Amino acid sequence: GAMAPSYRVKRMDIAKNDEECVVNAANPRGLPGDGVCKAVYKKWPESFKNSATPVGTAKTVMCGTYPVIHAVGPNFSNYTESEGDRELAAAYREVAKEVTRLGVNSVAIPLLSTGVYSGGKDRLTQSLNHLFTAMDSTDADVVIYCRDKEWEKKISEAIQMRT
């Protein structure tokens, strides 16, 4: 575990993370995809061997000794708000199990279902709160990776609020 487990946020490419493992915002078929998934495919292509897994699950594949946790959030274009909310919560619970099983002291994580799976809605608060529900009982240092400056500010404020 980390000596004083923390949450941090950084605005940069998750493929350049400084953590002991990465969470991919994966599609269920293990395809290269776009966004986080495509940068992850370019950085760790070996990790996409038998990475396909259902919505609401996480499957870890090693790239050398570096663990890539493929976490499949729901595409809110396809799910009802209610069913999507349940699957998004479940994907993060499966991430917490994998991070714990791997015995890592740190993990790089994107906000699942906030990009091309958002069904065109702002899901910063919904996705971040499900991340906290899952990860709060783990002792890994969590570093959240985001793209836009307003998202970095809002994620940083939500972390600082609970400290």
Site for Cl ion, residues 42 to 81, rule: CB under 5 A = none
Question: How near is the Cβ of 9 to ligand W3S at its closest, in Å?
Answer: 10
φ and ψ of 62, to 5 deg: -85, 135
| Cα-based angle 48, 30, 80 (whole degrees, multiple of 5) | 150
Query: Could you tell me which residues are annotated as the binding site for ADP-D-ribose?
Result: 13, 27, 35, 115-117
Question: How near is the Cβ of 3 to ligand W3S at its closest, in Å?
Answer: 28
Nearer to ligand W3S (CB atom), residue 93 or residue 147:
147
Residue 28 touches Cl ion, criterion: CB under 5 A = no
Q: Please give the C-alpha separations between residue 70 and each of 19, 94, 121, 123, 137, in angstroms, as whole numbers.
A: 16, 10, 23, 20, 20
Site for Cl ion, residues 82 to 141, rule: CB under 5 A = 115, 117
Give exposure, 10-40, as e/b (b: 16+ Cβ within 10 Å): beeebbebebbbbbbbbbbebeebeebbebb
Nearer to Cl ion (CB atom), residue 104 or residue 146:
146
CB atoms within 10 A of CB 88: 26
**Which of the listed partners (ligand W3S, Cl ion, none) does 76 bind, with a CB threshold of 5 to 8 Å by partner kind?**
none
120 by Cβ neighbours in 10 Å (0-12 / 13-18 / 19+) ranks as exposed
Residue 148 touches Cl ion, criterion: CB under 5 A = no
Question: How near is the Cβ of 23 to ligand W3S at its closest, in Å?
Answer: 12
Binding site for ligand W3S (CB under 6 A): 111, 114-115, 146-148, 151
State the residues that interact with Cl ion by CB under 5 A: 12-13, 115, 117
